[PDB]
Amino acid sequence: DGSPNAGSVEQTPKK
Amino acid sequence: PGVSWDSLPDELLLGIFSCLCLPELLKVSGVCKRWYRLASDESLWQTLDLTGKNLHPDVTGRLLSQGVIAFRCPRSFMDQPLAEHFSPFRVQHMDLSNSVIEVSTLHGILSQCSKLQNLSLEGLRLSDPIVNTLAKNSNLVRLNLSGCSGFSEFALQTLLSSCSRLDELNLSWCFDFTEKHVQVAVAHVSETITQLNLSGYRKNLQKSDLSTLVRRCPNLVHLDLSDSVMLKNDCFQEFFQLNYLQHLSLSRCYDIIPETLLELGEIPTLKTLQVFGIVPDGTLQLLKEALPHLQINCSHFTTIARPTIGNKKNQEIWGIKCRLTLQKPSCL
C-alpha cells in the first residue's frame, strides 16, 4: 500500500 | 443627379461609413481617390477581429499600421517572411493564443509594439530576442505565457525586471524549464502582481522558492500551484503568512496529507480551495462538511490572465468587444 498508484498515476490506464 | 454628392463634409462621410460592416468597408475603398484615402482612416479601424483567418504578414502589418487598439487573432496562419518595415503600432490589447506564427514574422511584428498593455502568447514558440523586445513595453498589466518555450533564464530575468507593473502572469507549463528558470521567476517577479499561476513544474519547485515568493510579494490573491510534488505539509506556514490570499488552488500535490487541509480553513480571507486528485472518496465529504465556509473543489479551470473566459461563446478580450469584425457564416 502507501503508493499503489499515487505519484506514478501519470500514465494511461491501458485497460 | 444635380447634387454634388462628392461635396460632402468629412464628418458625414465618416458617419455613414461607421455603419458599414467590415466585409463591405473594403468595397467602398475603390469608388474614388477621395473615398480611398478616407476608407483607411484611423477612426474606423479601432477593433480588429481576425479570429481563425489565414493572413499574409504584409496584410496584418498594414492593417496594424492603420491604427488599431485591439487586435484579436487566435489560431491564425501567417507563416511567410516579412518584406517591408512599418511605423510603430499602437496596439494596446493583443491576443495571439494558440496561433501558428513562426519566430521570424513574430519578431518582425512584435519588434514595433512598444505601447502594449495586455498580451497573450499561449502555446506560441518564442526565442531569446522576442522576450528581450517585450521589455520595451514596460506597461504590460497582464501577461499570458502558458505553453511558451524557447527562451533562456536571462531573457526571463530581463522581461520580469523591466515590466514593473504586471498585475497577472500565467507563467505555466513551459516544458523546457529547469530549476534556474523557476528560481529566476520567483526571484524577479515584481511585487505589484496580485495573481500567479506557476504550475506544473514538479521537482523544479522547492519550498525555498515558495518562501521567497511569499516573502517578496505581499499582494497575491490567486496562487494556483498545480502539480507541485515537492510542496509538503510543512509549507502551509508560508500560505498562512499570506494575508490577501483568496483562491489558493493546489492540485495533485501528493505530499499533502488531506486531513491537514483543515488547517488551511483557519485563513479568514480564503474563499475557494480547489484541491484535485489527492483527497479520496469518503473523506472528501467530511472535509467539505467540516469546513462550512470554503467552496472546496468547485472551479476546474483557471481564469488567470485569460482573454476570453466563460461558456456563452464570448468574443470580448478583457471586457472589450470588437465592433468591426469579419462576420461568421450564419445565413440559411
Place this chain on the structure above:
Amino acid sequence: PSIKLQSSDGEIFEVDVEIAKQSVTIKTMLEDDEGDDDPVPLPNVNAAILKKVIQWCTHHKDDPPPPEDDENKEKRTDDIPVWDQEFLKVDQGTLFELILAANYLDIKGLLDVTCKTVANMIKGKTPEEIRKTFNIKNDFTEEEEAQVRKENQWC
C-alpha cells in the same frame, strides 16, 4: 404666450422655441428668431415636422461602445421603427439637402437616421455603378485600381 421664435431662410416659419430644444444651434442662439439661414425651405420644414415628435423618440442612452457599433446597427436596421417620413423615400437630392441641413443644425436624431438610410442604400451595391448613382467620376486609372483590388483580396 409661450416663446415661439421663428426660423429665417428668406421666409418666416413659426416653431415653438421650447419644443425645438434638441437643436444645438437653436439652443445656443436662444440665449443670445433670425437664424438658420442656410437650410433650404424643404429640408427645414421636414426638420420641423420631425421635431414635432419629441417625447415619442424618448431620449439618448448611455452605452457608447455597443450603441454606435455595427452590432447594434444590425439591430438598427429598423432605422426609426415609427415612420421615417414614408421611410425617407424622398429623392436623392432632397435627401442630400436634408442631411446637409441636419449637419448644420447638429441634431443627433436626423444625423443618425439619415446616415443609416444612406448606409443601407449604399450597402449591397457593387461599386461599378455606386458612383454612377452618386455622380462621381472615378479618378482611378487602370493601374491605380489594380493596386486597390490587389490589397483587398483577403476578405
Place this chain on the structure above:
Amino acid sequence: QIYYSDKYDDEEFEYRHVMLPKDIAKLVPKTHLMSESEWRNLGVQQSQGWVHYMIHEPEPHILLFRRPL
C-alpha cells in the same frame, strides 16, 4: 467510461484523441484550449507531455493531444 484511442504518429510528433462521456463533455471549454492542470481536473489520466492543440467543432466532445518526438 472514458475511452482512449491508439496513438498515431507523424514527423516529430505523436498524436492521440480521447472521447468524453456526456457527464463531463458539457464542462469542456469552448473559447480556449486547456492546460495539463485543467484537463487532468476533468478526469483524463494520460502521461506527461500531452498538450491540447485543436478543438473539433462538429464533435466538441473529442479532445486532441500531440506530443513532440
